[PDB]
Amino acid sequence: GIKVFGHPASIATRRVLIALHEKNLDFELVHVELKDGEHKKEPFLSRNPFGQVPAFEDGDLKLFESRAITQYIAHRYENQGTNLLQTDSKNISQYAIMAIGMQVEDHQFDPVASKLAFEQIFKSIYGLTTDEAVVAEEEAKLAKVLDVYEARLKEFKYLAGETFTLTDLHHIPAIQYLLGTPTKKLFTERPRVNEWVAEITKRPASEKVQ
Amino acid sequence: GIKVFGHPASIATRRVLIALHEKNLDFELVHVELKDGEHKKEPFLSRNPFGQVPAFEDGDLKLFESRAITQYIAHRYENQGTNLLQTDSKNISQYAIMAIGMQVEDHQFDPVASKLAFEQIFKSIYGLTTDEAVVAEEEAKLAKVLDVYEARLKEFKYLAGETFTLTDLHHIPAIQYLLGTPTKKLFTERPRVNEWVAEITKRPASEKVQ
Ligand SMILES: CCCCCCSC[C@H](NC(=O)CC[C@H]([NH3+])C(=O)O)C(=O)NCC(=O)O
Ligand SMILES: CCCCCCSC[C@H](NC(=O)CC[C@H]([NH3+])C(=O)O)C(=O)NCC(=O)O
Numbered sequence: 001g002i003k004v005f006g007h008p009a010s011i012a013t014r015r016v017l018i019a020l021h022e023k024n025l026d027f028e029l030v031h032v033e034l035k036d037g038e039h040k041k042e043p044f045l046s047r048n049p050f051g052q053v054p055a056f057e058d059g060d061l062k063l064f065e066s067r068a069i070t071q072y073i074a075h076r077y078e079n080q081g082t083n084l085l086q087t088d089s090k091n092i093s094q095y096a097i098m099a100i101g102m103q104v105e106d107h108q109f110d111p112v113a114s115k116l117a118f119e120q121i122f123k124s125i126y127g128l129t130t131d132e133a134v135v136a137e138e139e140a141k142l143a144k145v146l147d148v149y150e151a152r153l154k155e156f157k158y159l160a161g162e163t164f165t166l167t168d169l170h171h172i173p174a175i176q177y178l179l180g181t182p183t184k185k186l187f188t189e190r191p192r193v194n195e196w197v198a199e200i201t202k203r204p205a206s207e208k209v210q
Numbered sequence: 211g212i213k214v215f216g217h218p219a220s221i222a223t224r225r226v227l228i229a230l231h232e233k234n235l236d237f238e239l240v241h242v243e244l245k246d247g248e249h250k251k252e253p254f255l256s257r258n259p260f261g262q263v264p265a266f267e268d269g270d271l272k273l274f275e276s277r278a279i280t281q282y283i284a285h286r287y288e289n290q291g292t293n294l295l296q297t298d299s300k301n302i303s304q305y306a307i308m309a310i311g312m313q314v315e316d317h318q319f320d321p322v323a324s325k326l327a328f329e330q331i332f333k334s335i336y337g338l339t340t341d342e343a344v345v346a347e348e349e350a351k352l353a354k355v356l357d358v359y360e361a362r363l364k365e366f367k368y369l370a371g372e373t374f375t376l377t378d379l380h381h382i383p384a385i386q387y388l389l390g391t392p393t394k395k396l397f398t399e400r401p402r403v404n405e406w407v408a409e410i411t412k413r414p415a416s417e418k419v420q
């Protein structure tokens with residue numbers, strides 16, 4: 001079967017889950033206890049030597065790294081449920097556009113969004129003090145990336161074209177967390193970005209992981 | 211026709227250049243003067259809103275982000291020069307293996323290798339003092355990534371399998387640099403990694419960018 005070895009609150013794990021719900025696939029979430037340092041010990045290390053979640057299995061195929069996993073799903077199960085690739089998934093040029101988008105959330109958006117969620121959400125649970133200077137700084141970085149999405153979105157319905165793809169999907173887990181933080185202003189204040197966010201988070205697959 | 215908008219000393223630009231030499235493609239490297247802040251103003255900003263090199267053009271098609279450019283090359287010019295995809299490039303599973311590897315070098319290797327080259331190489335040109343605490347630290351992170359590679363390379367000739375692919379190519383520029391730095395001890399003291407490094411560094415397309 002298809003099993004995801006991960007933790008339900010992690011952004012990366014959620015990214016896989018949504019791809020799975022989008023394709024309407026049956027899978028099993030095998031819970032890895034981050035809290036007891038499970039991700040840092042055998043046998044988990046055997047699934048991912050870099051000791052991070054998620055890890056994944058489709059029958060005899062074993063994968064780790066969430067971007068790689070979602071790409072595998074979009075292709076292996078292409079014609080099942082929602083196609084997560086470009087409408088013309090044969091066109092290398094169209095595909096190049098989406099691959100830049102995936103590359104961009106990875107380098108520009110994600111490290112920023114993750115630091116911001118760590119600061120305002122993870123810390124909260126354990127009563128740790130949020131660094132106000134870090135959060136103002138990271139928000140400076142985010143707005144910057146968001147001004148880019150804003151201009152892009154003034155010409156295309158979604159980031160990679162007129163269709164929802166892996167590029168948009170990849171941004172859901174982190175945005176869902178930031179929307180319940182005062183960082184939501186950066187999304188709400190930019191018209192085209194706000195609407196884009198409304199669309200991707202209102203999807204039922206997106207809703208299935210919160 | 212095909213042009214690279216970058217800097218010949220950049221690790222990300224050399225990554226695109228090696229792909230082209232590998233495909234036996236003719237191209238123009240249009241020099242973007244980083245030292246003059248050329249990358250942070252128009253019209254470069256219209257080729258890459260994030261203001262980073264390289265950017266790329268193949269006819270009407272414009273791209274940025276080196277990982278996305280080298281995959282474009284590997285596919286669009288698939289049956290030409292070297293095969294940078296797996297021997298069986300249609301195989302979804304084999305491609306998954308290669309993709310995980312490209313992701314690992316992006317997340318685990320690159321930040322580390324990049325910081326180590328900035329400290330020991332970049333700072334040197336300006337007489338800035340290389341911080342040795344950071345070097346020691348970052349080196350500790352690299353050692354452990356290379357330990358993973360040593361295990362893998364004991365199984366397969368290359369990282370994604372028995373063949374040289376985009377997964378390997380992507381590490382060349384950073385390795386070329388650190389080999390002229392005292393970090394080369396890390397590569398050389400690891401037998402399989404040592405052979406692997408020599409294999410991929412002695413390739414003509416690799417040598418044409420040094
Ligand atoms: C309840 C709040 C949940 C989200 C908290 C973000 S926690 C900090 C955590 N940091 C890391 O895992 C460090 C490794 C880094 N994510 C990498 O990929 O190299 C993270 O980025 N995690 C990202 C993730 O969950 O995938
Ligand atoms: C109650 C809230 C708990 C929130 C936990 C979030 S941590 C998840 C984190 N995973 C990652 O960073 C995975 C990133 C990886 N690049 C991918 O996309 O798969 C991890 O394993 N980090 C461990 C490490 O980096 O060592």
Ligand SMILES: CCCCCCSC[C@H](NC(=O)CC[C@H]([NH3+])C(=O)O)C(=O)NCC(=O)O
Pocket residue numbers: 219220221222223263324325327328331332387
């Ligand atoms: C003179 C030999 C120098 C070799 C080391 C390059 S210096 C560091 C350089 N850093 C950047 O470009 C900054 C990236 C980005 N601005 C950030 O937020 O970190 C880099 O990694 N650049 C990546 C690249 O070279 O493409």
Ligand SMILES: CCCCCCSC[C@H](NC(=O)CC[C@H]([NH3+])C(=O)O)C(=O)NCC(=O)O
Pocket residue numbers: 107217219220221222244249261262263264274275276277332
């Ligand atoms: C002696 C100088 C020669 C070495 C200069 C290296 S800087 C190159 C750097 N480019 C990148 O980091 C590219 C990263 C991008 N993720 C990619 O892979 O294309 C850049 O433009 N950085 C500018 C920035 O990020 O602000």
